[PDB]
Amino acid sequence: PQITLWKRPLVTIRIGGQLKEALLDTGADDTVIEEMNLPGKWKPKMIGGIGGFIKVRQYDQIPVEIAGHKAIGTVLVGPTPVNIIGRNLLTQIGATLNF
Amino acid sequence: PQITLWKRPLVTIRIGGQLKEALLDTGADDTVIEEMNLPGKWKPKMIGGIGGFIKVRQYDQIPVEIAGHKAIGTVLVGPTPVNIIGRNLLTQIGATLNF
Numbered sequence: 001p002q003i004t005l006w007k008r009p010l011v012t013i014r015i016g017g018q019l020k021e022a023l024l025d026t027g028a029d030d031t032v033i034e035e036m037n038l039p040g041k042w043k044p045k046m047i048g049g050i051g052g053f054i055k056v057r058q059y060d061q062i063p064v065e066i067a068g069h070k071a072i073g074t075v076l077v078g079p080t081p082v083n084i085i086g087r088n089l090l091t092q093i094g095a096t097l098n099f
Numbered sequence: 100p101q102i103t104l105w106k107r108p109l110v111t112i113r114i115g116g117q118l119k120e121a122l123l124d125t126g127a128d129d130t131v132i133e134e135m136n137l138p139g140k141w142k143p144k145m146i147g148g149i150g151g152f153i154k155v156r157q158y159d160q161i162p163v164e165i166a167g168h169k170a171i172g173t174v175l176v177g178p179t180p181v182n183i184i185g186r187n188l189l190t191q192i193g194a195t196l197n198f
C-alpha cells in the first residue's frame with residue numbers, strides 16, 4: 001500500500017497474540033512497544049530521544065505481523081507513549097520512503 | 100527518490116541559507132532542528148518525545164529545501180539529539196510510505 005502523511009501513519013500489528021496500533025516510524029532505529037507481559041528472556045537497556053531516555057526490556061526474535069506482513073526481530077518493551085515500528089522491522093516488510 | 104531503510108534516512112537540507120543533515124522522520128509530527136540562529140520572530144513552545152517534553156523556539160513560515168524540494172513551514176529549534184524533518188514538511192514535498 002501507499003500511506004500518505006497527513007495523519008500519523010498508524011497501522012494494526014499483531015504481537016504476542018495481541019493486536020495493537022503502531023506507528024510506521026522511519027526515524028526510529030528500533031521497535032518500541034508499550035508495556036506488555038511478553039514471555040521470554042530479556043536484557044535491560046536504555047533508549048533516548050527528545051526529552052531524554054527511558055528504560056526498556058530487549059526481547060530478541062519476536063514474531064510481529066505488520067498489516068498482514070510477517071517480520072521477526074528485536075522488540076523493546078517499556079513506557080513509551082505510543083507503539084513504534086522501527087527500521088529494524090520496516091526493512092523486513094520492504095517499506096520505502098518515496099518523494 | 101526511493102529511499103530504503105537499511106540505513107537511517109538522512110538527507111541534506113538547506114535552512115537559513117545554511118546546509119545541515121536531517122533525518123526523514125515519519126514518526127514525528129513536527130520538524131525539530133538543533134539550536135541555531137534563524138532570522139525572524141519565534142514563540143516559546145513545548146513538544147514531547149519518547150523521554151518527555153522539552154522547550155523549543157517556534158519559527159513560522161520558514162523556507163526549507165529538502166533534497167532539492169522546497170517546503171515553507173513551521174520549524175522548531177531546540178535541544179534534540181538529531182535534526183528531524185517531520186510530517187508537517189514531508190507532506191509538502193509529497194512524501195509517502197510504500198510497501
Ligand SMILES: CC(C)CCN(C[C@@H](O)[C@@H]1Cc2ccc(cc2)OCCCC(=O)N[C@@H](CC(N)=O)C(=O)N1)S(=O)(=O)c1ccccc1
Pocket residue numbers: 025027028029030031032047048049050081082084086124125126127128129130131146147148149150179180181183185
Ligand atoms: C529525535 C529522534 C532520534 C527520535 C527517534 N524516535 C522516533 C521519533 O519518530 C519519535 C517517536 C515518537 C515518540 C513519541 C510520540 C510519538 C512518536 O508521542 C508524542 C507525539 C509527538 C511527536 O510526534 N513527537 C516526535 C517529535 C516531534 N514532536 O515532532 C518524536 O519524538 N517522535 S524515538 O525517540 O521515539 C526512538 C529512539 C530510539 C529508538 C526508537 C525510537
